[PDB]
């Protein structure tokens, strides 16, 4: 019985691979070779945020490209007015060890978490005029690695229990739970329409799930090490991922296979964060060697380097309008380029 | 300046927040950080409770010689350790508890200590080995029912050091077993250390009340070594 089911799974995997190779008719390098080079890009630090005590670990731009939320292991969330280098809000956190932070698109709510195993959601516009604990979501049996907002009443969280949970803030209950992942889930990304989402885990596997149906529609296994970051193409039909193997792989949902690989010999460290610009041609990926690299997504060549750092590039993100990029590091220093 | 009234008010709020952050930094830096790990068979929980008198992180404050100490325990996080251990970088010490009384699973704890020591992230952080459960180990060795020779074939060849100073009122067999365990752990720690980080093993018991003083002394020696490194003396 167990042997029969294992053999059936092996046969289904082989069928998957055969279908992929059947649709693996051509590579992007062959098609993209006729595209003009992006050329050298000179990105220089435009704004420095200094008021943090320890490692910065998470950051997400809201609907606007001005406000910036940052989370620091000193146990603090800081909302900065990026245009004016002003700390809009400072919030101490009950748990010093923080690793994730999410900004609601409307800006009325912020979320974060870490090793406390409970995701904390606060709000900025309380009638009292002060930040308060809006919600304390509990049930994940492992650290919270990432979290994202579908809307003000829905929140998606990924944890180390090999399970991801979509919660309702009104009732504070696990609205939906996915247990299909095998390894620890590290990062989470939201598709434009929000009807689908993609997650990445330490088993060298990325998985696509439906928000409502909640089944693993497709899986991607092209990495050889633990996956640290995930980001979806702006069109929402593709995504990119990076792992400790010192390489980046970009896959397409529609074809259900890998589309392109970005890497070079000199890089010998893991990946921290990956993101795309408004056009999607610029793929910005952080690194553990105190550097960040922006590559040509289509032609897969080194376009620019951001070396303004003293420690890990823990987090990096792009704005909605794509006017600038933010990068937070272990040295408690935030640098914004453009 | 060009800032409008409502911009200068925001700037004033920003400077107030900066001063508050300075105060929080002042409060934060005066304390020393400890990450405490061990197994269920290890006397972790009793050690934590004595120091006092589904959350994935447990915090414990304790003051020794007018010095504040954070103690952080991870109990609910899964067996996997290489991922969530990166968060605990820049911690002054790592207190690893080993059940010296337990012989069956001593090899697994030894392998765990090897893995933590070989960690690339924890390559400049000091480790304090608390070989807990010393009365139980004493009785187990004295009775003779369980022999460490079977589990560790080199214990037969191992000898009691002449330089060793046995504890008062200690039988030779208990001292030999304790020193053999400490010898194995010290041999593992020394390898790959290269002087970057130092290990500080100590014999500790469940009811022993010297844990605070021993931890303070080890975290003072660690600080002295670090300052030697930084102030251009070594």
């Amino acid at each position, epitope marked *: 019985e167990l042997d029969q089911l294992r053999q059936e799974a092996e046969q289904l995997k082989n069928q998957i691979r055969d279908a992929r190779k059947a649709c693996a008719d051509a590579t992007l390098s062959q098609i993209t070779n006729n595209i003009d080079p992006v050329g050298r890009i000179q990105m220089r630090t435009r704004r420095t945020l200094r008021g943090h005590l320890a490692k910065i670990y998470a950051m997400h731009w809201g609907t606007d490209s*001005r*406000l910036l939320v940052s989370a620091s292991q000193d146990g603090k969330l800081i909302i900065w*007015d990026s245009y*004016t280098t*002003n700390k*809009v*809000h400072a919030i101490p956190l009950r748990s010093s060890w923080v690793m994730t932070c999410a900004y609601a698109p409307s*800006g009325n709510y912020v979320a974060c978490g870490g090793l406390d195993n409970i995701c904390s959601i606060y709000n*900025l*516009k309380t*009638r*009292e*005029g*002060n930040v308060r604990v809006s919600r304390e979501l509990a049930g994940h049996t492992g650290y919270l690695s990432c979290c994202r907002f579908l809307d003000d009443n829905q929140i998606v969280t990924s944890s180390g229990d090999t399970t991801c949970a979509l919660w309702d803030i009104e009732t504070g209950q696990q609205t939906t739970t996915f247990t299909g992942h095998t390894g620890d889930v590290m990062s989470l990304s939201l598709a434009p329409d929000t009807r689908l989402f993609v997650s990445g885990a330490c088993d060298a596997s990325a998985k696509l799930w439906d928000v409502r149906e909640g089944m693993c529609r497709q899986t991607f296994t092209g990495h050889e090490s633990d996956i640290n970051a995930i980001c979806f193409f702006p069109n929402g039909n593709a995504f990119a991922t990076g792992s400790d193997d010192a390489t980046c792989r970009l896959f397409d949902l529609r074809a259900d296979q890998e589309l392109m690989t970005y890497s070079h010999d000199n890089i010998i460290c893991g990946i921290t964060s990956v993101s795309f610009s408004k056009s999607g041609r610029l793929l910005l990926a952080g690194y553990d060697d105190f550097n960040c690299n922006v590559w040509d997504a289509l032609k897969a060549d080194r376009a620019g380097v951001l070396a303004g750092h003293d420690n890990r590039v823990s987090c990096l993100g792009v704005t909605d309008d794509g006017m600038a990029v933010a990068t937070g590091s272990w040295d408690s220093f935030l640098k914004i380029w453009n | 300046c*060009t800032l*409008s*009234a*409502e*911009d*200068k*008010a*925001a700037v*004033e*709020r920003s400077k*107030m927040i900066e001063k508050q952050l300075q105060k929080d930094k002042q409060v934060y830096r005066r304390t020393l950080r400890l990450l405490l790990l061990g197994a269920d068979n290890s006397g972790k929980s009793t050690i934590v409770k004595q120091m006092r008198i589904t959350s994935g992180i447990f915090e414990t404050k304790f003051q020794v010689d007018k010095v504040n100490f954070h103690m952080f325990d991870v109990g609910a996080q899964r067996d996997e350790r290489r991922k969530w251990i990166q968060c605990f970088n820049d911690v002054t010490a790592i207190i690893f508890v080993v059940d010296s009384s337990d012989y069956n699973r001593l090899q697994e704890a030894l392998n765990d200590f090897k893995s933590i020591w070989n960690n690339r992230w924890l390559r400049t952080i000091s480790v304090i080995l608390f070989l807990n459960k010393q009365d139980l180990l004493a009785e187990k060795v004295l009775a003779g029912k369980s022999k460490i020779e079977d589990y560790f074939p080199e214990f037969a060849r191992y000898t009691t050091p002449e330089d060793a100073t046995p504890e008062p009122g200690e039988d030779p067999r208990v001292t030999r077993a304790k020193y053999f365990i400490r010898k194995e752990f010290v041999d593992i720690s020394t390898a790959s250390g290269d002087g970057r980080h130092i290990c500080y093993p100590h014999f500790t018991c469940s009811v022993d009340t010297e844990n605070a003083r021993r931890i303070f002394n080890d975290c003072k020696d660690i600080i002295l070594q670090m300052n030697l490194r930084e102030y251009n003396l070594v």
Partner: single-chain antibody
Framework: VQLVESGGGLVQPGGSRKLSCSAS????????MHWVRQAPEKGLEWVAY????????YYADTVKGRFTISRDDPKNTLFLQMTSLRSEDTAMYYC??????????????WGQGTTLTVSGSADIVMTQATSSVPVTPGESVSISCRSS???????????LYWFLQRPGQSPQLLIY???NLASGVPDRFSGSGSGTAFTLTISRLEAEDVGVYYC?????????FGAGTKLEL
């Protein structure tokens, strides 16, 4: 949210008085406090402003060297000690909380006020052409107010605020920074304009939408108020 003020009463010419405002329900250390005076059957006049943490203190020309303001943060209290009171100072005095940051909404809460009885060069002249325009429920209305200087700043924010003093009540923020609608105010109310000419439109008038409407600037510290435009049932 609760601001209760006391200390208003009968005074003699030349004496001093002390107004105490207690605050409860909201943080007092993170909110700037404004003292505002309105003469009987007259418009609102700004007295003073004190920022958070006793950082910035600003008065008006007519009350310079006579009024003093202070804030007891632990007691969440505001003190206004005013000297050499005269017949020109009789008025209803309100304490107003304000918060300043990107996306903020200052002048959002007003105290009930205290009744005090005793016996322009550089300021922005906040004109209000309309004086008293009767209107009925179910009819859209609009009121325009001007300024001596183009209030638009390099920031892009036009610092124009619209308040409503319903009969026998304290003023209420309706619109901030010329277009942003305050929390809890109906969407009937809408504000628009350009640097030196602004307007407030109430889509479907109602009994609640009756009172004097005031238009204030926020560039110069004087924080001058508009003259007023009453509505009738």
């Amino acid at each position: 949210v609760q601001l209760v003020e006391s200390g208003g009463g009968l005074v003699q010419p030349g004496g001093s008085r002390k107004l105490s405002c207690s605050a409860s329900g909201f943080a007092f250390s993170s909110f700037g406090m404004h003292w505002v005076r309105q003469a009987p059957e007259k418009g609102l006049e700004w007295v003073a402003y004190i920022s958070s943490g006793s950082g910035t203190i600003y008065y008006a020309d007519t009350v310079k060297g006579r009024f003093t303001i202070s804030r007891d943060d632990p007691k969440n209290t505001l003190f206004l000690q005013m000297t050499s009171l005269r017949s020109e100072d009789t008025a209803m005095y309100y304490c107003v909380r304000s918060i300043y940051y990107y996306g903020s909404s200052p002048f959002d809460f007003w105290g009930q006020g205290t009744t005090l009885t005793v016996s322009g060069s550089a300021d922005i002249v906040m004109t209000q052409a309309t004086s008293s325009v009767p209107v009925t429920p179910g009819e859209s209305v609009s009121i325009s107010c001007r300024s001596s200087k183009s209030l638009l700043h390099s920031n892009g924010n036009t610092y124009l605020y619209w308040f409503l003093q319903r009969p026998g009540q304290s003023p209420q923020l309706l619109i901030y920074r010329m277009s942003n609608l305050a929390s809890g105010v109906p969407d009937r109310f809408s504000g628009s304009g350009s640097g030196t000419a602004f307007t407030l439109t109430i889509s479907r008038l109602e009994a609640e939408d009756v009172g004097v409407y005031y238009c204030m600037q926020h560039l110069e510290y004087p924080l001058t108020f508009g003259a007023g435009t009453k509505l009738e049932l």
